[PDB]
Design a protein around this ligand. Structure first.
Ligand SMILES: O=C(O)c1ccc2c(c1)nc(Nc1cccc(Cl)c1)c1ccncc12
Length: 324
């Protein structure tokens, strides 16, 4: 398997674009930042609201815990500089003694998605998904997969109507035929390729994750596919897409399933998208939304829309018009 778009981007841009092992960071002055308030903690980071003291301006300091992965995240954030709806890198600093690095990013006025998403209109969903598609089409066009696309990593200032894709700590460069680690993404947003241990994945992983997110929004069910473990996650997906399309996909990519799917995985017919429509979510539902969702949520990553193809979908016509 090789990506159907942007496969040769890292080839064309060469070693100085993707070789993060040999990154030399020009560290900023740590005493130029003051930390004010912790805003959050991750598996990999603490995040604090802070001040850039020379300018007295609001910013974020992300303190990070292998060295390899710090360099990857920094090199990606430098390469993505200037890109639409990508979180802006302000600096990289570290402790004088301990050498613990921190990434300094722009501050965003987020509304938590459990609160924000239900307040959305149909146009709002169309608009923010379109804004997210600009960020993903940008990073894919630069040889980079995000690999952790989920609502926590999409920051929305609903007053400014502005969007930022954050947390590039799982992101990687795409190299044709590379076998990538499948333990990426949070469980609810993992593509089938991660769940059957198909390692030769590409940018199209982000598009499955986008699909899950989009299903949450239009069907008002967070998360859409609610599995308990990685095994059950594939069962929840199979109970919607069906097992017929699953077996053709496995056959097509020569994937053999783990032995202990045979007890838990039954034969399920395809549930139509229409069966998820209710009184409460009908506000979001149109024939264009379902068709768009259908073209993102495919077993076969090579059948999913590209971010670019997705921007031309009729679903986004109210948004292209409103921008003229
Ligand atoms: O990782 C980044 O690149 C990254 C970049 C920017 C923010 C962030 C993470 N996390 C934020 N908040 C947050 C909220 C809950 C949990 C956690 Cl760990 C963090 C946040 C807030 C305000 N503006 C920018 C950010």
């Amino acid at each position: 398997s090789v990506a159907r778009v942007y496969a040769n981007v890292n080839e064309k841009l060469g070693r100085s674009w993707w070789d993060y092992d040999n990154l030399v960071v020009q560290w900023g002055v740590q005493d130029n930042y003051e930390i004010v308030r912790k805003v959050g903690r991750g598996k990999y980071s603490e995040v604090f609201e802070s001040i850039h003291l020379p300018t007295d301006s609001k910013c974020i300091v992300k303190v990070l815990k292998k060295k390899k992965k710090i360099k990857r995240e920094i090199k990606i954030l430098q390469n993505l500089a200037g890109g639409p709806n990508v979180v802006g890198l302000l600096d990289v600093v570290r402790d004088s003694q301990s050498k613990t690095p921190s990434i300094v990013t722009e501050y965003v006025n987020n509304t938590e998605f459990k609160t924000l998403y239900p307040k959305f209109s149909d146009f709002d969903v169309r608009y923010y998904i379109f804004e997210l598609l600009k960020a993903l089409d940008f990073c894919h066009s630069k040889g980079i997969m995000h690999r952790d696309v989920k609502p926590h990593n999409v920051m929305i200032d609903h007053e400014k109507r502005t969007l930022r894709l954050i947390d590039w700590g799982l992101a990687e460069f795409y190299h044709p035929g590379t076998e990538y680690n499948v333990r990426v993404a949070s469980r609810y947003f993992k593509g089938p390729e991660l769940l059957v241990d198909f390692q030769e994945y590409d940018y199209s992983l982000d598009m499955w994750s986008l699909g899950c997110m989009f299903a949450s929004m239009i069907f008002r069910k967070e998360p859409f596919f609610h599995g308990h473990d990685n095994a059950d996650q594939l069962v929840k997906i199979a109970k919607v897409l069906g097992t017929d399309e699953l077996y053709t996909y496995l056959e097509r990519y020569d994937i053999d399933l783990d032995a202990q799917f045979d007890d838990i995985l039954g034969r399920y017919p395809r549930k139509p998208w229409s069966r998820f429509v209710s009184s409460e979510n009908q506000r979001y539902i149109s024939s264009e939304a379902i068709d768009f969702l259908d073209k993102l949520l495919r077993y076969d990553h090579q059948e999913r829309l590209t971010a670019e193809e997705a921007k031309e979908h009729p679903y986004f016509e109210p948004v292209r018009q409103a921008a003229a």
